[PDB]
Amino acid sequence: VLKKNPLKNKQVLLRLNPYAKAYAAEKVGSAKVEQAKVKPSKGQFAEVLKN
């Protein structure tokens, strides 16, 4: 009788998407990425500056 938005209603969100809980529990939306500090532009791609 009444549509409920899952983006506002948490219970409807869990009803439709059971994985949402895990996404919140693991902080998937703010998960860091592990990588080294590398700059692969020092070579030829520096022709972006001038060509």
């Binding site: 022709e47 972006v48 500056l49 060509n51």
Partner: protein, 171 residues
């Protein structure tokens, strides 16, 4: 417009006859990458036998200003269409960013020649390193030693409708 400088690189679509086509680069001043890729094809089809359907966009990259807080003088070469014919001009601008000087150029030619954005081709934008490279007096006058000037007749923007005191323009 509010613009950015883009690198767009493209090529003809590879053929079994021609399997490594030449890569072409252009510097495009556009508000966004959708126009930047559109302007790229506009200038290739004026210089080479290529189309968007028979070609390919390789890369689009923003070119940031090298020294955004250094005051420069830019010489710009133009090709614009009037109501009657097509003309070339060379105009000079003082600005800190290469993009903004182009933004000044578009405002300038709209004001002085009624030239719309569609009517203008930028042939070249060049930094003027030396002072003797400056040809136009409307920018040469700001390169003088120890330049000072007041701002007479300051107008203060009032928040209220009615001021109880007489206005003043000192500054």
């Amino acid at each position: 417009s509010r613009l950015n400088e883009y690198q767009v690189i493209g090529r003809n679509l590879p053929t079994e006859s021609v399997p490594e086509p030449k890569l072409f680069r252009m510097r495009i001043f556009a508000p966004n990458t959708v126009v930047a890729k559109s302007r790229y094809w506009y200038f290739l089809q004026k210089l080479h036998k290529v189309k968007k359907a028979s070609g390919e966009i390789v890369s689009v990259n923003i070119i940031s200003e090298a020294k955004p807080t250094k005051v420069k003088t830019f010489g710009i070469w133009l090709r614009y269409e009037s109501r009657s014919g097509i003309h070339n001009m060379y105009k000079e601008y003082r600005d800190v960013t290469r993009v903004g000087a182009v933004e000044t150029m578009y405002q300038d030619l709209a004001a002085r020649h009624r030239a719309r954005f569609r009517s203008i081709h930028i042939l070249k934008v060049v930094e003027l390193e030396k002072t003797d490279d400056v040809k136009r007096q409307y920018v040469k006058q700001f390169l003088t030693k120890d330049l000072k000037f007041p701002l007479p007749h300051r107008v203060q923007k009032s928040k209220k409708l009615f001021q109880a005191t007489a206005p003043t323009t000192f500054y």
